[PDB]
Every structure is written in structure tokens, then in C-alpha cells.
Structure 1
Amino acid sequence: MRPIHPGEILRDEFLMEFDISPAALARALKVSAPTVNDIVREQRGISADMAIRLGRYFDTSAQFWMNLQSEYSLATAYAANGKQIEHEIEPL
């Protein structure tokens, strides 16, 4: 009943489930602390690079993270520009 930012999933399903702080996760992923923390704060998306890193580290699949992101981005784009795009583009 809402589009879920991937950082929500990382925060509630992995970080808080495994009791891992953002800074600790960043050290294990070999990235800077803002890279993990901006995602967890729902202020950054999952890059292709971070999906590999997250899937490698948490055993999960990398596509899983990519799909979380692309669904979030599609829903975010739609709510923003959907009715306008539909008003200006006639199909076939």
C-alpha cells in the first residue's frame, strides 16, 4: 500500500535483524560509511555495485536488490509524472 525504499529492507530485514550497524556493514562491504548510511536513511538508491556487494555479503541474490530498486524507482517516477505522461503520449 506504498512503495518501499530498498533501504527500509536493508535496515529492518538485515541490519536490525543481524544487529549490524551501518558503519560496521560499510567496513565489511569495503565502502565508505555514508554509502551504507545514506541507503539506510532512504536518501540513496542501490547501485549495481552495491547490489553485488550486498548479495555477496548477505548470501542473498544480487538481482533481488536490483529489483527492489527498479520497482521503487518506477513507482517513484510514476507517482511523480505518470498522469502527465499518460496525458501527452497516445499509444498505438
Structure 2
Amino acid sequence: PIHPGEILRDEFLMEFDISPAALARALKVSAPTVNDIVREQRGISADMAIRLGRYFDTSAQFWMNLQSEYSLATAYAANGKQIEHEIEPLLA
């Protein structure tokens, strides 16, 4: 599962030689907001998805999808088996 911050850092920040601090100024958010994303310690909010799409000329939903897929896989790795053990599917 790929944290969206890895794409942000590798596909955009490094590609265009833009620092997290420089990006935060262009996005009108605080430096720790971008830095925490790039360190893969914060997920991408809906607000951040719009800002990143707008600044980098990408789909906003592209960022939403990276996050939701990562969130789903991370939740599943943590609790998938327990959920499957306690919930019997309606087909039965």
C-alpha cells in the first residue's frame, strides 16, 4: 500500500525541485501540514486534495483515491481478519 505522501514527494516535489516549505507557501497552508504528509504521518484531507490538484494541475479525485485506497488497505491489515471473524455475510 502506497502512502499518498510518497507520490507527493517522489512524483511532484522531487520532480519539480520544490521543497515542502515552498509547497506549503504556494498552497497557503502551514509547513507541518506538507511535511507531515511527505513523512507519511498524515493522510490527505479533502481540502488538501483540492489544493494539490489545483497547484499541480492534477485531478483532485486522484489524491482522494490514493488516500482512500491506502486507508482501506491499512484498516484491512489491522482489522480485516477480526471483522471477517465476527461478521457473517448476509448470504447464509
Shift of residue 21, structure 1, vs aligned partner: 0.1
Residue aligned with 1:20, SS:
coil
In structure 1, list runs of 5 or more residues that go unmatched: none
Q: CA deviation at 1:22?
A: 0.1
Deviations 1:18-48 (A, max 9, x none): 0000000000000000000000000000000
Q: CA RMSD in A?
A: 0.2
CA distance in 2, matches of 1:10, 1:42: 10
TM-score (norm 2): 0.96
Which has the greater radius of gyration? 2
* Alignment-derived partner of residue 60 in structure 2: 62
SS at match of 1:45: coil
Superposition TM-score, scaled by structure 1 size: 0.96
Give the paired residue count.
89
| CA distance in 1: counterparts of 2:22 and 2:37, whole angstroms | 14
Q: What is the aligned-residue identity percentage?
A: 100
Following superposition, the deviation at residue 59 of structure 1 comes to 0.3
The CA deviation at 1:9 is 0.2
**Which 5+ residue runs of structure 2 have no aligned equivalent?**
none
- The runs of 4+ residues in structure 1 deviating greater than 3 Å are none
2:35 aligns with one of 22, 34, 37: 37
How far off is 1:79 after superposition?
0.2
